[PDB]
Amino acid sequence: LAIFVVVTYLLTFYCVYSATKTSVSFLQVTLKLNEGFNLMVLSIFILLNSTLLWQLLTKLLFGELRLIEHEHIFERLPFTIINTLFMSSLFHERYFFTVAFFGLLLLYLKVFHWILKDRLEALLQSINDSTTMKTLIFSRFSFNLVLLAVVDYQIITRCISSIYTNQKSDIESTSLYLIQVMEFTMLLIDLLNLFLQTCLNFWEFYRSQQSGKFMYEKAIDVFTRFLKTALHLSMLIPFRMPMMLLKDVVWDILALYQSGTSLWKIWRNN
Amino acid sequence: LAIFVVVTYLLTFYCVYSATKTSVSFLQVTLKLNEGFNLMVLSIFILLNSTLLWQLLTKLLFGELRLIEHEHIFERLPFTIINTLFMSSLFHERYFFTVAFFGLLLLYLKVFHWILKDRLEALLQSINDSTTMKTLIFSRFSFNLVLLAVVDYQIITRCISSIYTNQKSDIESTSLYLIQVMEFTMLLIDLLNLFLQTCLNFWEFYRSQQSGKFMYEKAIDVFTRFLKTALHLSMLIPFRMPMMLLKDVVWDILALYQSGTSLWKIWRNN
């Protein structure tokens, strides 16, 4: 594969070079490239470059990935892919390549988020060897979670600005981008859960170091389900394909059942 | 996820049931379902079912998958996905869901083929513990390879029949299906390589048991590259987007360079 990318570069260079050599003004070149085949070549090259970066970003964040992470990712992917493709298909007619881009972005982040969860478990397990040191060591989760948190927030902030700016012109495309807000919001919400769980885990450490948690853990997980449910439910307000959004609303309802079970335990305890 | 699928079933059932309850003839039902929303529901359900089967097919063939397989798969996937999507995009206008289906089929097989290669290495390594027994044990590769071989051949056979049958009507769609023949042929060719390599590995075993291989190994790998190159080159004959096919033709040319290196060693040896 590495060389496939090298060759794509060489083609891409020529494509530009040729348009350049055969023109006088950079604007003439700009169009020739954005007009035909050469644009598609550039697009392919960009996607390959993005992909290579995401692989690096894993190396700089998670490194090698543990078997257990590889397994969870492998299992979650084909279904993640179907569902993304379903919501994506809706707008292919107007935006296919932009949509394909966002499709990839959502995947790469979902993968990073799934991995992060497993990294929390690892840092929790190491508590006994660190003992006192967890006080500072736990920040290793933060230097994974926070980094993703910044990215998720930035995407949402940017999506919204764009939507508002052209909301009256993008009469259908608002749904494209507003769905993206929902999906990226869902990631931000899951990350918030991991934050809160981390906080409760650090809280237990503290109390031991200082020297009912189970229900505190449920309260976090129950709230999280509620918050996510509220998001997907409010998403059904716009006219464009509420029935397609509904598949996730319905999943959240299943989660709401799981909340019901946790709630029963809470209510019973009093 | 498991329950997402259960719910999809329940919806899908109702969708049909309702059309059924509210009709007299099965044909009225057939249309209502194939006419609107209910068709899409059925399509979603089918894709989920196919996915679950592919997961089972792994369990019945490769089981759990070794870390090394998980790693190779993980790394090869995003690029496999880009390139499939590129060739797929070309026909989305007329066939998106059929195309998406074939996209998934090509992936699942590529994954099975990548895994198979690694299973050959494992069976080769075990030679020393089996000693004499390799005589029969090696058939374990065959009960992986042959099974995929049957499937690859059947797909090709079926694709061709369909193409010929409607070749004069599918004036553009021939390219869709003919590209699929090429891609599935490429899998059949890679599998042929593994067969031949297995045969040469068994051949070495035999000679030891009976009691220059490196160049024999190269001759197989060099032929394989040639055969694949010839396929992709002949694929540029049809009018429809020879430039898109060209990306693989060009990759094969890179391989042809690798053949050149192996050939030099052969020519030198004489």
Side-chain angles (χ1 to χ4, degrees), chain A:
Chain A
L1 295 172
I3 305 306
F4 179 82
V5 179
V6 171
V7 172
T8 303
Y9 167 76
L10 294 170
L11 172 61
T12 304
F13 168 79
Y14 180 75
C15 291
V16 175
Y17 173 80
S18 183
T20 303
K21 186 176 182 182
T22 60
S23 301
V24 177
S25 170
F26 77 93
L27 293 169
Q28 291 173 304
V29 177
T30 298
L31 174 59
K32 288 177 195 179
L33 298 174
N34 290 339
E35 182 177 3
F37 169 76
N38 291 347
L39 176 59
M40 189 62 228
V41 172
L42 177 61
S43 177
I44 293 165
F45 185 59
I46 291 164
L47 292 168
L48 294 170
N49 289 340
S50 181
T51 302
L52 291 170
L53 175 60
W54 285 107
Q55 291 180 334
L56 177 60
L57 293 173
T58 300
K59 290 178 182 179
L60 299 173
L61 182 63
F62 307 115
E64 299 177 353
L65 303 177
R66 292 174 289 163
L67 175 61
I68 191 64
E69 294 162 354
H70 280 275
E71 291 175 358
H72 291 168
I73 295 163
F74 180 82
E75 292 168 349
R76 291 170 183 272
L77 285 171
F79 288 102
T80 298
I81 292 165
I82 291 166
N83 288 334
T84 303
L85 184 59
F86 174 76
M87 294 308 297
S88 296
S89 181
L90 178 58
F91 302 96
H92 283 175
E93 181 179 2
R94 296 185 187 283
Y95 296 100
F96 174 72
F97 280 111
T98 295
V99 176
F101 163 77
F102 276 109
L104 287 168
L105 176 58
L106 285 163
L107 186 149
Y108 285 121
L109 295 171
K110 285 173 182 181
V111 172
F112 286 7
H113 284 67
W114 298 335
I115 295 161
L116 181 68
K117 183 263 287 174
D118 282 343
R119 290 283 298 279
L120 182 54
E121 175 65 17
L123 289 167
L124 181 58
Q125 290 171 1
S126 75
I127 189 166
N128 290 333
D129 296 302
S130 293
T131 70
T132 295
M133 283 302 299
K134 188 177 188 68
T135 302
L136 303 176
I137 296 298
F138 87 97
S139 66
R140 289 178 182 170
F141 192 65
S142 295
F143 293 114
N144 283 278
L145 181 141
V146 172
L147 299 172
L148 293 174
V150 170
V151 173
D152 284 348
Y153 183 75
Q154 288 169 346
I155 292 166
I156 295 298
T157 303
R158 291 166 183 154
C159 291
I160 292 165
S161 180
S162 181
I163 292 165
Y164 184 77
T165 300
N166 299 282
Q167 191 168 51
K168 294 180 179 179
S169 297
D170 278 320
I171 62 171
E172 293 182 346
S173 303
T174 295
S175 183
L176 170 61
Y177 297 115
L178 187 61
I179 292 164
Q180 289 166 27
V181 170
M182 173 195 78
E183 290 168 336
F184 287 114
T185 301
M186 178 179 67
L187 286 168
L188 186 57
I189 292 170
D190 285 344
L191 193 61
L192 175 61
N193 179 264
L194 288 172
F195 172 79
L196 294 170
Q197 291 179 348
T198 300
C199 295
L200 193 67
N201 289 337
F202 194 66
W203 169 85
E204 180 177 31
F205 163 72
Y206 166 76
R207 294 295 184 189
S208 181
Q209 188 66 24
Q210 180 180 45
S211 179
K213 180 168 186 268
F214 176 77
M215 295 311 300
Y216 290 70
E217 291 171 352
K218 293 298 186 177
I220 293 167
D221 287 348
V222 172
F223 169 74
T224 302
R225 286 173 166 74
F226 163 77
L227 181 62
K228 193 183 292 185
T229 302
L231 169 66
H232 283 97
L233 183 59
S234 291
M235 282 291 295
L236 294 175
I237 291 166
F239 82 93
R240 182 78 166 190
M241 302 302 172
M243 292 305 293
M244 292 181 70
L245 288 169
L246 188 62
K247 74 176 170 49
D248 292 305
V249 173
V250 172
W251 189 89
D252 290 348
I253 291 166
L254 294 170
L256 200 62
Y257 182 79
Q258 295 168 340
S259 292
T261 298
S262 293
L263 286 164
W264 172 85
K265 291 184 175 68
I266 293 166
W267 293 334
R268 180 187 56 79
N269 287 335
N270 299 282

Side-chain angles (χ1 to χ4, degrees), chain B residues 113-249:
Chain B
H113 284 67
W114 298 335
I115 295 161
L116 181 68
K117 183 264 287 174
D118 282 343
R119 290 282 298 279
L120 182 54
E121 175 65 17
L123 289 167
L124 181 58
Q125 290 171 1
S126 75
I127 189 166
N128 290 333
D129 296 302
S130 293
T131 70
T132 295
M133 283 302 299
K134 188 177 188 68
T135 302
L136 303 177
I137 295 298
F138 87 97
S139 66
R140 289 178 182 170
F141 193 65
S142 295
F143 293 114
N144 283 278
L145 181 141
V146 172
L147 299 172
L148 293 174
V150 170
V151 173
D152 284 348
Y153 183 75
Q154 288 169 346
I155 292 166
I156 295 298
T157 303
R158 291 166 183 154
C159 291
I160 292 165
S161 180
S162 181
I163 292 165
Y164 184 77
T165 300
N166 299 282
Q167 192 168 51
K168 294 180 180 179
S169 297
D170 278 320
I171 62 171
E172 293 182 346
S173 303
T174 295
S175 183
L176 171 61
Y177 297 115
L178 187 61
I179 292 163
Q180 289 166 26
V181 170
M182 173 195 78
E183 290 168 336
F184 287 114
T185 301
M186 178 179 67
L187 286 168
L188 186 57
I189 292 170
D190 285 344
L191 193 61
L192 175 61
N193 179 264
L194 288 172
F195 172 79
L196 294 170
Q197 291 179 348
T198 301
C199 295
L200 193 67
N201 289 338
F202 194 66
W203 169 85
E204 180 177 31
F205 163 72
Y206 166 76
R207 294 295 184 189
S208 181
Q209 188 66 24
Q210 180 180 45
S211 179
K213 180 168 186 268
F214 176 77
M215 295 311 300
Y216 290 70
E217 291 171 352
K218 293 298 186 177
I220 293 167
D221 287 348
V222 172
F223 169 74
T224 302
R225 286 173 166 74
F226 163 77
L227 181 62
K228 193 183 292 185
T229 302
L231 169 66
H232 283 97
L233 183 59
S234 291
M235 282 291 295
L236 294 175
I237 291 166
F239 82 93
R240 182 78 166 190
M241 302 302 172
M243 292 305 293
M244 292 182 70
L245 288 169
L246 188 62
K247 74 176 170 49
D248 292 305
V249 173

